[PDB]
Scaffold this active site. Structure first.
Site, PDB file in Angstrom:
ATOM      1  N   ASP A  39      69.375  -1.004 -12.436  1.00 13.14           N
ATOM      2  CA  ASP A  39      68.030  -0.630 -10.871  1.00 13.14           C
ATOM      3  C   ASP A  39      69.099  -0.395  -9.398  1.00 13.14           C
ATOM      4  O   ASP A  39      70.081  -0.203  -9.671  1.00 13.14           O
ATOM      5  CB  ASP A  39      66.585  -1.364 -11.121  1.00 13.14           C
ATOM      6  CG  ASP A  39      65.724  -1.026 -11.008  1.00 13.14           C
ATOM      7  OD1 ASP A  39      65.585   0.215  -9.774  1.00 13.14           O
ATOM      8  OD2 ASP A  39      64.980  -0.981 -12.266  1.00 13.14           O
ATOM      9  N   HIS A  69      62.717  -3.176  -6.342  1.00 10.27           N
ATOM     10  CA  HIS A  69      62.356  -2.834  -7.816  1.00 10.27           C
ATOM     11  C   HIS A  69      63.053  -3.122  -9.163  1.00 10.27           C
ATOM     12  O   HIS A  69      62.692  -3.551 -10.152  1.00 10.27           O
ATOM     13  CB  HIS A  69      62.388  -0.801  -7.830  1.00 10.27           C
ATOM     14  CG  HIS A  69      61.561  -0.476  -9.471  1.00 10.27           C
ATOM     15  ND1 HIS A  69      61.969  -0.614 -10.389  1.00 10.27           N
ATOM     16  CD2 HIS A  69      60.965   0.528  -9.249  1.00 10.27           C
ATOM     17  CE1 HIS A  69      61.914  -0.167 -11.532  1.00 10.27           C
ATOM     18  NE2 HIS A  69      60.193   0.266 -10.438  1.00 10.27           N
ATOM     19  N   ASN A 161      57.239   8.807 -15.318  1.00 12.01           N
ATOM     20  CA  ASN A 161      55.829   8.607 -14.716  1.00 12.01           C
ATOM     21  C   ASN A 161      55.393   9.727 -14.564  1.00 12.01           C
ATOM     22  O   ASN A 161      55.461  10.356 -13.571  1.00 12.01           O
ATOM     23  CB  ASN A 161      56.040   7.452 -13.500  1.00 12.01           C
ATOM     24  CG  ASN A 161      56.292   6.373 -14.367  1.00 12.01           C
ATOM     25  OD1 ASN A 161      57.846   5.338 -13.146  1.00 12.01           O
ATOM     26  ND2 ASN A 161      55.880   6.033 -15.094  1.00 12.01           N
ATOM     27  N   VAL A 177      69.239   6.539 -27.682  1.00 13.01           N
ATOM     28  CA  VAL A 177      68.635   4.904 -27.061  1.00 13.01           C
ATOM     29  C   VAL A 177      67.133   4.832 -27.648  1.00 13.01           C
ATOM     30  O   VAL A 177      66.896   5.225 -28.503  1.00 13.01           O
ATOM     31  CB  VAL A 177      68.830   5.058 -25.702  1.00 13.01           C
ATOM     32  CG1 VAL A 177      70.345   5.366 -25.099  1.00 13.01           C
ATOM     33  CG2 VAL A 177      67.987   6.442 -24.726  1.00 13.01           C
ATOM     34  N   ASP A 200      59.986   5.913 -28.785  1.00 13.10           N
ATOM     35  CA  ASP A 200      60.387   5.050 -29.981  1.00 13.10           C
ATOM     36  C   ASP A 200      59.362   4.034 -29.764  1.00 13.10           C
ATOM     37  O   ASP A 200      59.124   3.363 -30.641  1.00 13.10           O
ATOM     38  CB  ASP A 200      61.525   4.906 -29.879  1.00 13.10           C
ATOM     39  CG  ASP A 200      62.964   5.390 -29.536  1.00 13.10           C
ATOM     40  OD1 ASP A 200      61.983   6.835 -30.462  1.00 13.10           O
ATOM     41  OD2 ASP A 200      63.860   5.578 -28.788  1.00 13.10           O
TER      42      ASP A 200
END
Length: 279
Positions: A39, A69, A161, A177, A200
């Site tokens: 990040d 973040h 988002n 993934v 998932d």
């Protein structure tokens, strides 16, 4: 163990029903597992991390998280108060600057770094990776998430988002993934959370309370807040020996809370992350 007055996201992964505020978990709490946080950086000196967090890589002038973040996401993986796996090892890989942005190649280089650096760390219970970032579709950002998964690390990525199908976004559209959506305290899909047949699992993503830079805490919403829930859950699940990095996302979706979430578009999976812990 039982943490009273825990954040709603933590209680919800230990509850078959919403509206509770107690987080239950085996006292192992991810002791022996590792979770990389790719990040903006992790404020390793936050008392909430108990010296279990440290920066292993940066691609900018400083490994300091000047954004907050990455500090929030790392606190959701394995801090003492807001963390899922309260005994894991947290590794920081700063691929996004202090504005939360970064080049795709810088992100790709960060994913390759983790697939090699795990041989420099001690993780007898496995390696987890939380990728709370994302942009447009890219077959090269996808293929690098798959390389991180194939090396032996669980890769959990934010769905995005955008309130759209996550098929046009990377590395959310990588099928190997684990693509994580967001939900709120009332078991509804977050109004921003992405959907699609590539998702998932769903995690708590709306109004997530976790650590923040400066030694502080705050509440923020996003699919980047529900990915550390699943990344931390797997580290917890791998430490207990329920599952492996390669089969974590399939195990988490096999033990989940089926059909409890509202406003899930047709064709999207209705599964909420659940630790299945029985006190």
């Amino acid at each position: 163990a039982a943490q009273t007055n825990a954040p709603w996201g933590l209680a919800r992964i230990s509850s078959t029903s919403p509206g509770t505020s107690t987080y239950y978990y085996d006292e192992s709490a991810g002791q022996g597992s590792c979770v990389y946080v790719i990040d903006t950086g992790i404020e390793a000196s936050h008392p909430e991390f108990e010296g279990r967090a440290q920066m292993v890589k940066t691609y900018y002038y400083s490994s300091r998280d000047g954004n907050g973040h990455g500090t929030h996401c790392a606190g959701t993986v394995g801090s003492r108060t807001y963390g899922v796996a309260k005994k894991t090892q947290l590794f920081g890989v700063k691929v996004l600057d202090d504005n939360g942005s970064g080049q795709y190649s810088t992100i790709i280089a960060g994913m390759d770094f983790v697939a090699s650096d795990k041989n420099n760390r001690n993780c007898p219970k496995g390696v987890v990776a939380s990728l709370s970032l994302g942009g447009g579709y890219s077959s090269s950002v996808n293929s690098a998430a798959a390389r991180l998964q194939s090396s032996g690390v669980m890769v959990a990525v934010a769905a995005g988002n955008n309130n759209a199908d996550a098929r046009n976004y990377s590395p959310a559209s990588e099928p190997s993934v684990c693509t994580v959506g967001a939900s709120d305290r009332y078991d509804r899909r977050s109004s921003f959370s992405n959907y699609g047949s590539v998702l998932d699992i769903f995690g708590p993503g709306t109004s997530i309370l976790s650590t923040w830079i400066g030694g502080s805490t705050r509440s923020i919403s996003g699919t980047s807040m529900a990915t550390p829930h699943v990344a931390g859950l797997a580290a917890y699940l791998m430490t207990l020996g329920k599952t492996t990095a390669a089969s974590a996302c399939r195990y988490i979706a096999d033990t989940a809370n089926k059909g409890d979430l509202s406003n899930i578009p047709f064709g999207t999976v209705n599964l909420l992350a659940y630790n299945n812990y029985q006190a």
